[PDB]
Amino acid sequence: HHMIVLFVDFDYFYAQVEEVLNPSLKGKPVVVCVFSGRFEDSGAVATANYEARKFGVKAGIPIVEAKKILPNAVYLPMRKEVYQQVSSRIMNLLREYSEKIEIASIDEAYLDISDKVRDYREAYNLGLEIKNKILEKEKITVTVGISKNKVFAKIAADMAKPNGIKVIDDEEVKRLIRELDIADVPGIGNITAEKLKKLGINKLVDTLSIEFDKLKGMIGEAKAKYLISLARDEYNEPIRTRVRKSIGRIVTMKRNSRNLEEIKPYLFRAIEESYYKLDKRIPKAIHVVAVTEDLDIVSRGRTFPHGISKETAYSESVKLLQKILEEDERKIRRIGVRFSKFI
DNA sequence: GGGGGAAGGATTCT
DNA sequence: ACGAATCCTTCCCCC
Ligand SMILES: Nc1nc2c(ncn2[C@H]2C[C@H](O)[C@@H](COP(=O)(O)OP(=O)(O)OP(=O)(O)O)O2)c(=O)[nH]1
Ligand SMILES: [Ca+2]
Ligand SMILES: [Ca+2]
Ligand SMILES: [Ca+2]
Ligand SMILES: [Ca+2]
């Protein structure tokens, strides 16, 4: 009659993996950190388990502030490659439940189980079978969301987290479209949430009382059509494979700088790691990205009529870096590169 | 008018 | 006080 989407989101992923790899951590507050090297505990928290998030320690806060709060918790350096491989294996399993699987991030995917189930009961049961299987195979708990479309599947999981499973039937979808704060709609951050308030829109439904063109004028057409769809209970994007369209590395310097020679080593380090990661991929475009001292972001790039060799990336990146320092007077704090337009 | 594409910045999100 | 997709606006070349 319509689509049946099942969304899967692993719980406090990075930290749970640290637990799996060292179960003696369970029960204790675990904090996976991103150490910037600027000083002792400079950096931010990538994520934390619930035992630590109930005290305010979470993704985003400085490491120093988290220690102010939980001086005795366990602080571990982020090990991105490890969580990715654990993630891949879990994605492979889900893959065994549908052909139409959309891997949205390192720890979440949507499955189109439209022709694997009939009605939500079976759907609900396919959920447990999945949770139970990932738990057994990898000992990772995950939350499951099930609804008529990706957006509501996602919302379903946010509401059941953690270690939960939830269904939002078409009847209930019609309540959310009236009761759900527009801000909690995926893809609607602070900037959009506030533009929406100023226009009197606090709930999805409200997007129906406003003139379309005004919406578009205030938050863009893409975002306007998006909200109106969900609002008209007509949203139906299909689950679909998504391949990486960009690869890059950005690093924080020990000190902010404008001296080309102090910045080069970091930039070159970024290019190295990036190329290593490109694997058998050849980019036609390169961008140099810089985070200025006032945590602002400037970038300069160029697209070549052919692929980019490492030597070409080294040379071109230095020129783009020079463009930045020239057109922007602020000191540079973070420097990096991003490659795209793969051949 | 429109199409096509490329830069650079804005937003979001995990 | 730390990697990546989508979208918006402007600028440009041109039939
Ligand atoms: N470096 C960095 N990584 C993040 C950040 N937020 C999330 N991540 C990465 C590592 C986290 O383990 C993974 C988390 O995905 P989610 O934020 O959706 O949930 P998490 O797994 O954090 O726990 P949860 O979904 O809230 O139960 O994504 C962030 O702000 N900075
Ligand atoms: Ca998660
Ligand atoms: Ca997630
Ligand atoms: Ca939000
Ligand atoms: Ca998130």
Output the six-digit token pair for A303: 């697209």
Number of neighbours of residue A85 by Cβ within 10 angstroms: 11
> Which ligand is in closest contact with the Cα of A18?
1
- For ligand 1, is residue A111 a contact (CB within 6 Å)? no
Q: Determine which one of A108, A237, A311, A329 is catalytic.
A: A108
Q: How far apart are CA A239 and CA A103, in angstroms?
A: 9
Q: Nearest 5°: phi and psi at A298?
A: -120, 145
A298 dihedral zone (left: phi>0; alpha: psi -120 to 50; beta):
beta
Q: How far apart are CA A86 and CA A140, in angstroms?
A: 10
Residue A59, classified by CB atoms within 10 Å of its CB into exposed (0-12), middle (13-18) or buried (19+), is: middle
Closest residue, by C-alpha, to the C1' of B6: A303
Tell me the CA–centroid distance for residue A163 and ligand 5, in Å.
16
Q: How far apart are CA A267 and CA A337, in angstroms?
A: 7
C-alpha distance across the termini of chain A, in Å: 40
User: Nearest nt to A9, CA vs C1'?
Assistant: B14
Output the six-digit token pair for A243: 């391949």
Tell me if the domain spanning A4-12+80-168 has CATH number 3.30.70.270.
yes
- Eight-class DSSP state of A268: H
Known binding site: residues of A? 9, 107
Angle between helices A150-160 and A170-179 (to 10 degrees): 80
> Is it true that the peptide bond before A162 is cis, omega within 30 degrees of 0?
yes
Angle between helices A212-219 and A221-231 (to 10 degrees): 130
Per-residue b or e along A315-326, where b marks 16 or more CB atoms closer than 10 Å to that residue's CB: ebbbebbebbbe
Q: Is the distance from CB of A169 to CB of A123 less than 8 angstroms?
A: no
Q: Nearest 5°: phi and psi at A220?
A: 90, 150
At which residue do the structure tokens 């189930």 appear? Answer: A117
Tell me the CA–centroid distance for residue A262 and ligand 4, in Å.
39
Q: Is the distance from CB of A13 to CB of A85 less than 8 angstroms?
A: no
Alpha helices in A139-220 (DSSP H): 150-160, 170-179, 190-198, 212-219
Q: What is the edge-to-edge ordering of all strands in the sheet holding A108-112?
A: A101-105, A108-112, A5-10, A142-147, A165-167
Q: How far is CA A200 from CA A194, A197, A208, A226, in A?
A: 10, 5, 11, 18
- The ligand 1 atom nearest the CA atom of A34: 1
Q: In what helix (H) or strand (E) does residue A256 lie, and over which residues does it extend? A: strand A246-257
**In DSSP terms, which residues pair with A337 in a beta bridge?**
A249, A288
Q: What 3-state DSSP class applies to A188?
A: coil
User: Nearest nt to A34, CA vs C1'?
Assistant: C2
User: What is the rounded radius of gyration, in angstroms, for the C-alpha atoms of chain A?
Assistant: 23
CATH of domain A13-79: 3.40.1170.60
Give the technique used to solve this structure: X-ray
Resolution (A): 2.4
Q: Tell me the residue type at A240.
A: R
Per-residue b or e along A106-122, where b marks 16 or more CB atoms closer than 10 Å to that residue's CB: ebbbbbbbbebbeebee
Calculate the dihedral angle through the C-alpha atoms of A64, A66, A71, A72, rounding to the nearest 10 degrees: -130
Give the pairing type, strands A43-48 and A142-147: unpaired
Reply yes or no on whether A108 is catalytic: yes
- The ligand 1 atom nearest the CA atom of A59: 30
Distance A96 CA to C3 C1' (A): 28
Q: How far apart are CA A161 and CA A174, in angstroms?
A: 22
Comparing C-alpha atoms, which of A78, A100, A83 is closest to residue A10? A83
Q: How far apart are CA A27 and CA A102, in angstroms?
A: 32
Q: Tell me the residue type at A65.
A: E
Output the six-digit token pair for A1: 């009659």
CATH topology for the A246-338 domain: Dna Ligase; domain 1 (3.30.1490)
Q: Is the distance from CB of A288 to CB of A321 less than 8 angstroms?
A: yes
Q: What is the edge-to-edge ordering of all strands in the sheet holding A297-303?
A: A246-257, A332-342, A283-292, A297-303
- For ligand 1, is residue A162 a contact (CB within 6 Å)? yes
Distance A8 CA to B14 C1' (A): 14
Long-range residue pairs from A178-181, CB within 8 A, at least 24 positions apart, any chain: A178/A203, A178/A204, A178/A205, A179/A203, A180/A155, A180/A204
Q: Is the distance from CB of A320 to CB of A301 less than 8 angstroms?
A: yes
Q: Is the distance from CB of A338 to CB of A246 less than 8 angstroms?
A: yes
User: Nearest nt to A223, CA vs C1'?
Assistant: C7
Q: How far apart are CA A181 and CA A15, in angstroms?
A: 29
One CATH from 3.30.360.10, 1.10.3720.10, 1.10.260.40, 1.10.150.20 for A169-235: 1.10.150.20
- For ligand 1, is residue A12 a contact (CB within 6 Å)? yes
Output the six-digit token pair for A127: 């959920």
Q: How far apart are CA A218 and CA A142, in angstroms?
A: 37
- For ligand 1, is residue A19 a contact (CB within 6 Å)? no
Q: Is the distance from CB of A314 to CB of A297 less than 8 angstroms?
A: no
Please state the domain extents for chain A: 4-12+80-168, 13-79, 169-235, 246-338
Q: Is the distance from CB of A116 to CB of A97 less than 8 angstroms?
A: yes
Cβ A218 to strand B below 7 Å = no
Q: How far apart are CA A33 and CA A43, in angstroms?
A: 7
At which residue do the structure tokens 């909200």 appear? Answer: A227
Q: What 3-state DSSP class applies to A237?
A: coil
- For ligand 1, is residue A46 a contact (CB within 6 Å)? yes
At which residue do the structure tokens 């934390």 appear? Answer: A48
